[PDB]
Design a protein around this ligand. Structure first.
Ligand SMILES: Cc1cc2nc3c(=O)[nH]c(=O)nc-3n(C[C@H](O)[C@H](O)[C@H](O)COP(=O)(O)O)c2cc1C
Ligand SMILES: Cc1cc2nc3c(=O)[nH]c(=O)nc-3n(C[C@H](O)[C@H](O)[C@H](O)COP(=O)(O)O)c2cc1C
Ligand SMILES: CSc1cccc(Nc2c3cccc-3[nH]c3ccccc23)c1
Ligand SMILES: CSc1cccc(Nc2c3cccc-3[nH]c3ccccc23)c1
Lengths: 201, 199
């Protein structure tokens, strides 16, 4: 089977379209014969710490006695270990205010750590996450795919690429603010992309 | 001018974007602009993360319940400050190919339907007028004009949403290449600051 790490960042809980389409993508993989081993985080419910001065110092190797900082460092180590153990990373990244949801960005700020998931100080750029590919589910109220207003796509390609995750496929559901038919059209397009992506290992 | 200054670095007194912001504002005073400053260190303000109950209150779908009232009043305050300004100066160093979390948390409190933008039948319409922006963005690597710069299009798009179409950037890049890269990027930013402050 595959070790699949699933990140849900929507604030709309069990009514989330990105969480629905993630669940459909995982069901489609099961139907295509992948017996996945899921590690799932609802980042919206996890109250991840924000990166601040003391946490940044501690993640780079400073010894910080402070107990909140010691367990934010342990949380960073756990999240990085899950990432490196996975074969497939599935990310819910609906567009909120031209960016990803804050809880997804807080996950990246805990896993994107020099000497843990990348190196920036060597003669050439080096990712340290190997054998991991990503599928991003990104719904939007408006239409943005291939437009200058889509910073989400290049942001996720660049931060995943920093860590060595070069293979990133997107499931887009756009124009969802045009209800009901724009939303139906966008979900139909997403479901056709799910069908095409579900067979690959 | 009424200048709204947002600092988002986590590097405290060693922050390069906070230093370059201070140098930009001082260059304006040297050029004879008598600016009135409103300054927020967003890293010290513990802004709330946008979650379902806050979003419901900010969109006006529900009255704010007691524990959220403060966050709604903060949103209204930050938006009033923005609409009262002529010039918005933003510290946005690149952290993990994005802006710092505290800057994003500011945008999630001010980018608000019926307050800074309005739904139309096609594209959303900005409600903030008379505001131009200057963004100070330092980077360890070199990203300007490259597909790895998502910070620049993100900021142009969320500022553009609210009606802020005039956005100038001050870049200090290649700072992880020391000693020459850091000195070279800061000298480039200072030359950009001097060109901008005289306007
Ligand atoms: C806080 C917030 C901000 C949003 N900002 C944008 C935006 O900048 N552009 C856009 O096209 N849609 C925007 N939308 C619409 C969402 O992208 C769209 O509804 C999406 O399908 C929501 O996904 P979810 O149900 O998984 O949360 C926003 C929605 C929310 C809740
Ligand atoms: C948490 C963190 C993450 C960073 N990520 C990046 C990165 O993605 N790309 C880059 O070129 N530099 C990166 N850097 C380097 C900063 O962009 C650079 O040091 C900048 O000048 C810091 O600005 P400041 O001192 O105002 O906080 C990062 C630095 C920090 C502290
Ligand atoms: C989230 S903890 C952490 C620990 C160590 C490093 C980083 N990020 C950095 C970069 C990522 C791309 C280029 C970078 N250049 C840097 C220069 C100075 C300080 C940090 C970084 C983050
Ligand atoms: C941070 S409070 C807030 C209140 C109201 C609206 C928003 N943002 C939205 C957009 C901004 C660009 C296009 C958008 N489409 C949306 C569709 C549904 C719900 C919200 C939005 C945010």
């Amino acid at each position: 089977g595959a070790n699949v790490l699933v990140l849900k960042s929507s604030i709309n809980g069990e009514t989330s379209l990105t969480n629905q389409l993630i669940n459909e993508f995982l069901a489609a993989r099961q139907a295509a014969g992948h017996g996945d081993r899921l590690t799932e985080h609802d980042l919206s419910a996890m109250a991840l710490p924000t990166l601040d001065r003391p946490l940044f110092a501690a993640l780079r190797g400073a010894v910080d006695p402070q107990p909140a900082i010691r367990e934010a460092v342990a949380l960073s180590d756990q999240l990085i270990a899950e990432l490196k153990a996975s074969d497939l990373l599935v990310i819910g990244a609906p567009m909120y205010n031209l960016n990803v949801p804050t809880d997804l960005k807080k996950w990246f700020d805990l896993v994107a750590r020099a000497r843990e998931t990348f190196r920036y100080t060597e003669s050439w750029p080096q990712g340290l996450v190997e054998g991991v590919r990503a599928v991003v589910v990104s719904s939007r109220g408006g239409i943005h795919q291939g437009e200058t207003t889509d910073a989400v796509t290049p942001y996720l390609r660049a931060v995943l690429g920093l860590m060595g995750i070069q293979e990133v496929e997107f499931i887009y559901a756009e124009g969802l603010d045009n209800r009901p038919h724009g939303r139906d059209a966008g979900i139909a397009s997403a479901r056709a992309q799910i069908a095409r992506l579900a067979v690959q290992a």
